[PDB]
Nucleic acid binder design. Sequence first.
DNA 1: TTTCGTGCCAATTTC
DNA 2: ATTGGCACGAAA
Lengths: 79, 48, 50, 376, 99
Amino acid sequence: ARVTVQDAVEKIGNRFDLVLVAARRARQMQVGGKDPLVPEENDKTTVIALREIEEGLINNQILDVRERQEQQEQEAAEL
Amino acid sequence: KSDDVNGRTKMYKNIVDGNHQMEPGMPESFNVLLKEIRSLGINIELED
Amino acid sequence: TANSGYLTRRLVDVAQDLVVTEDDCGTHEGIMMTPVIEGGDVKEPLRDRV
Amino acid sequence: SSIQVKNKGSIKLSNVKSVVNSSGKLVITSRNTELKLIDEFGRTKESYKVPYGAVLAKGDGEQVAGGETVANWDPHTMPVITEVSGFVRFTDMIDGQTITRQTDELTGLSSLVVLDSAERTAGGKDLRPALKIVDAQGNDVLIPGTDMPAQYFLPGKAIVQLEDGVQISSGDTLARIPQGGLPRVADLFEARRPKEPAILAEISGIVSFGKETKGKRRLVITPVDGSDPYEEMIPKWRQLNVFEGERVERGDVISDGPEAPHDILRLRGVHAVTRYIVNEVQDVYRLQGVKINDKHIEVIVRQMLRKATIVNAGSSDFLEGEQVEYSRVKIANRELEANGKVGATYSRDLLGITKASLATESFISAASFQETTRVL
Amino acid sequence: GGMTNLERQQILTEEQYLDALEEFGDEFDAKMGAEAIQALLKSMDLEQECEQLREELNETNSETKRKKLTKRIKLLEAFVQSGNKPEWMILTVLPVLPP
DNA sequence: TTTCGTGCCAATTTC
DNA sequence: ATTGGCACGAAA
């Protein structure tokens, strides 16, 4: 569970940017077909995203790289 | 949660489907205000 | 209560649009901070003002 | 009445124009004299105001101890003391035309009483009396550091104590002159003017009087350099606190009372007005034990200082005497300066929160706040 | 004003108007109501008024007159800069709110 | 004549 | 109630 977000804030550097990054990752895990990078323990996607950010597995650069890689793979395998 | 009529029905449908996202739109009271200001003979409009 | 509410509404209205939109402006101006002393008693030390 | 020092430390004097009397002590002849208690570390601890014409037991920089009276002055008397020592001779002072003869019934020690233009004869309206200091040879004694002859004018309701032909010295009184809460914060932020605002000096230089009983009294200020003599129209019933032929500086106290923030901004600047507002608000809040940072009051004051008035168009397109945004003026001037041209010249304006919030560039916000019909 | 000594904005009365009719005849025009105000607003030229007011402002010296002329020139220039016309402040058609 | 004093009128007052 | 701005009249 979550009681504080201080570690994730120090990982990202901003609360305002942390909210956006966590929302992006949580929407990927909720509506998309993504799987969590940490073992989900009766948690919701927002808390899972916060825990992923806390361990350094998720940030804006990583999300952008993953999106570019997925788009490139889709365009390469479309033919 | 208010006078935006189409987003009201979109949000309920999204919540029932398990998608917690919204499409905000324009409040209705602002349109009422525009009509009431136009009824005074003042040309007020949105541009671009 | 009503007077306090009216005062705070006016204060909100005058300054609502002020946001931190930068990191440094390069200015060299400033205010000189000195301890607040009235008569024979130091009302406020310098530490809490800087 | 007297200044009672609390702790032990060195004494510092600021803005002092003082002279040594016959008794050897020091008498201050400056209006803006401030007394500070600076200790060995050099930190100010006590601050007091020493009124014009006061007696100091200790000099500037002398060591003092706790519980010591350093200053003493008469609160009900305004001295008109001189600087040089010599005999007193009257000039342009005639009994029954400018003054009166009223002798005390019991004490028996009194002299001619100086009257005002509202009491003297018409012929005395064009006469300006004075007292001149002379020596045993009859020549005028010059004040050290100055070239003008030392003669002092006398205002109305002045009670002379020493008759003609009596020796005086420096520091001697020629004559005696007889004399919060939520609404406070709301008035401070609305920048209201007080009922009896303190009158300041618009321009520095020598001071003098003008035509008397012209509906209201007149004051003239002629700067040391060649400049236009300013005109002040101080209405009577107000106790003027400046003699004729006195050097004054712009933004200095002439009459007494609360000082309007607009005058402070016009004559002293932006830092002065912001610190005045901060000090007043914090004084109101500290009585109740409320702790608020100064950042918030500073941002409110900044939002109050959002308008400027153009004094001349220059090379810009701003019409003279119009009210515009300070940021717009800065942007236009920095754009014209980079082209080698000349920008405009402006003066900051101070508005209350209600007036400043109705002068915003967005009409939606102004209509939301209040007075929708006028804004629309 | 016509050929007579009447000004372009002088206020008359019923008796004065009848006297002017019986003396001068049809040489002058006088009206009452919002039609007269609309005629006055329609017949004024903003550029000429601005130029005349600017000249009169830069001619003489005063304090209150300067502020009044500044206000009037500000209003005239505000009307000039935008596409608005002075006679649009008199209503000939009235909007009706949706039911 | 120009400047200043004085009366009239509008807009404000919590949730 | 209070405050601010505008018209009106009276002062030098």
